[PDB]
Amino acid sequence: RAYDMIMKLLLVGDSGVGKSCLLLRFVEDKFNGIDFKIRTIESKGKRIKLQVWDTAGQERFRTITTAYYRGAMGIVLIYDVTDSRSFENVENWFQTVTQHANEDAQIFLVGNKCDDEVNRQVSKEQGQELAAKLNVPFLEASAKSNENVDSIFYELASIIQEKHVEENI
Amino acid sequence: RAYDMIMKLLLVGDSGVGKSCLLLRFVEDKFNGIDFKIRTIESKGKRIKLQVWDTAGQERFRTITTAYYRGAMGIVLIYDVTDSRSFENVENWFQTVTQHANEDAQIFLVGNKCDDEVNRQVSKEQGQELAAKLNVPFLEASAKSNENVDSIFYELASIIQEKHVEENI
Ligand SMILES: Nc1nc2c(ncn2[C@@H]2O[C@H](COP(=O)(O)OP(=O)(O)O)[C@@H](O)[C@H]2O)c(=O)[nH]1
Ligand SMILES: Nc1nc2c(ncn2[C@@H]2O[C@H](COP(=O)(O)OP(=O)(O)O)[C@@H](O)[C@H]2O)c(=O)[nH]1
C-alpha cells in the first residue's frame, strides 16, 4: 500500500539541546547543516511518511526562512532539561514559530536529555507547567536512552491526523 | 558540504498527463499513490535538495489537502500537448493552486509529451500563449525523450532561489 499521508515535522530549539540527536535516534535508532530525514510509521492503520526537519541552526543572523515554517504540520519545540537557560528561551521559540507557522500547525513541547539526572536543572513538572500554559502537549525524552523518542512523533502524527485540514472543492 | 536550501516542488495536472513519469524521469532518469521523491541539484553554486511531490491524484472527491499546497515553493502545472481537453482544464488548476498556495510560491507551466508529434493537439505557441497570460514561465517537455525535463526543475529552483523570503528577526 502506498502512503496515506505525508507530514512535515519541524524541530526547533537552541543549539546543543539535542535536535540532530533526536532526529538520528528516531530515524536511524542511533546515538552519537540543513537537511530532512524520513521515517515511515503507522498511525491508526494509516501509513504516514514522516518528514523531520532540522533547520533552526543554519539560518542567517536575525532572519527566518518563512517557507520552511510553512507547510510544516508539526513543530517540536525542544529544550534541555539539564540547561535551564534553554528552557527559559522557549518563550522566544514559541513566539517565533506561532508567528510564521500556520494556524493548523501543531506544536509539541519536548524536554530532551531526560536521562542526565545528575545534571538536571529543569524539573519534569516545570516542563508540564510551561506546556499547559502554551496549550501544547508535553513529553520528556532522551536521544541517549531512546525514552519517549518514538512517542514524540507518533503522538504528534496522531494529532495532525485529527487536526489537518481537507477543505472542500 | 551540507545542503544550502530545501525546495518543496508540487506537481499538478489532470490524470494521465505524465506527472509520475516526469517525476520518474527527473529523479531516476527512466521512462515507463501519495509520495515525494528527492534529487540533489546545484543552482548558482548552491546545493539544493529538491522535494518533488505527486499528490494531485489521490485527493478525496471535491476536497484539497491544504497543508500539501502550503510550504510548496514551486508548483509545476502540467498538461498534455496531445490532449487539448487537458490544456483547457489548466484554468481550473491555476485557480485552485493560487487560492491555496502562498503568495511567494512560483508557478511553472509545462506541456508534457512534446515527443508525440503525431498526436499533438495543442501547439507550442498555444502553451506559450497561456503561460504569458497567467504570468508564469513555460517549457514543453517529455518524460520519454528527456527533453527539457531537467530544465523544468532547474529553472524553477533558480526562480525560487531569487524569490524565496528570508524575513528579518
Ligand atoms: N545525555 C544526553 N545527551 C544528549 C542527548 N541528546 C543530545 N545529547 C548531547 O548533546 C550534544 C549536542 O546535541 P546536538 O545534537 O548537537 O543538539 P543540536 O545542536 O540542537 O542539534 C551531543 O554531543 C550529545 O552528546 C540526550 O538525550 N541525552
Ligand atoms: N509519449 C509520451 N508519453 C508519456 C509521457 N509522459 C507520460 N506518458 C504516458 O502517459 C501515461 C500516463 O501518464 P502518468 O504518469 O500516469 O500521468 P499522471 O497520472 O498524471 O501521473 C503513461 O503510461 C506514459 O506512457 C511523455 O513525455 N511522452
Q: Dihedrals φ, ψ of A65, to 5°?
A: -80, 95
Q: How far is Cα B67 from Cα B108, in angstroms, rounded to an integer? A: 20
Q: Dihedrals φ, ψ of A96, to 5°?
A: -75, -40
Contacts for A31 with CB less than 8 Å, ≥ 6 apart? A21, A24, A25, A143, A144, A146
Cβ-contact B144, B166 below 8 angstroms: no
Contact B2 A63 (CB under 8 A): no
Residue-range domains of chain B with CATH: 1-169 (3.40.50.300)
- Cα of B17 from ligand 2 centre, angstroms: 6
Q: How far is Cα B46 from Cα B23, in angstroms, rounded to an integer? A: 22
- What was the resolution (in A) of this experimentally determined structure? 1.9
Cβ-contact B27, B52 below 8 angstroms: yes
What phi-psi label fits residue A128: left (phi over 0), alpha (psi between -120 and 50 degrees) or beta?
Answer: alpha
Three-class SS of chain B? CCECEEEEEEEECCCCCCHHHHHHHHHCCCCCCEEEEEEEEEECCEEEEEEEEECCCCCCCCEEEHHHHCCCCEEEEEEECCCHHHHHCHHHHHHHHHHHCCCCCEEEEEEECCCCCCCCCCCHHHHHHHHHHHCCCEEECECCCCECHHHHHHHHHHHHHHHCCEEEC
Experimental method for this entry?
X-ray
Cβ-contact B50, B155 below 8 angstroms: no
| DSSP class per residue in chain A | --BSEEEEEEEE--TTSSHHHHHHHHHT-----BEEEEEEEEETTEEEEEEEEE-SSSPPTTEEEHHHHSS-SEEEEEEETT-HHHHHTHHHHHHHHHHHS-TTPEEEEEEE-TT--TT--S-HHHHHHHHHHHT--EEE-BTTTTBTHHHHHHHHHHHHHHH--EEE-
Cell reading at A145: 536512552
What phi-psi label fits residue A61: left (phi over 0), alpha (psi between -120 and 50 degrees) or beta?
Answer: beta
- Chain A residues in contact with B71 (beta carbon < 8 A): 8, 67-68, 70-72
- Chain B residues in contact with A35 (beta carbon < 8 A): 2-3, 6, 49
For ligand 1, what atom is nearest to the CA of residue A21?
A: 15
> CA angle B1-B6-B7, nearest 5°?
145
**Chain A residues 127-166 with CB within 8 Å of chain B:** 164-166
Q: Whose CA is nearest to atom 22 of ligand 2?
A: B18
Give yes or no for residue A115 CB within 6 A of ligand 1: yes
Q: What sign for the dihedral angle of Cα A103, A48, A23, A66?
A: negative
Sheet of B106-112, strands arranged across: B35-43, B46-54, B5-12, B74-80, B106-112, B138-140
Q: Does A61 touch chain B (CB under 8 A)?
A: no
Helix axis angle for B19-27 and B149-163, nearest 10°, is 80
Contact A6 B73 (CB under 8 A): no
Task: Find the CB nearest A71 among B8, B62, B165.
Answer: B8
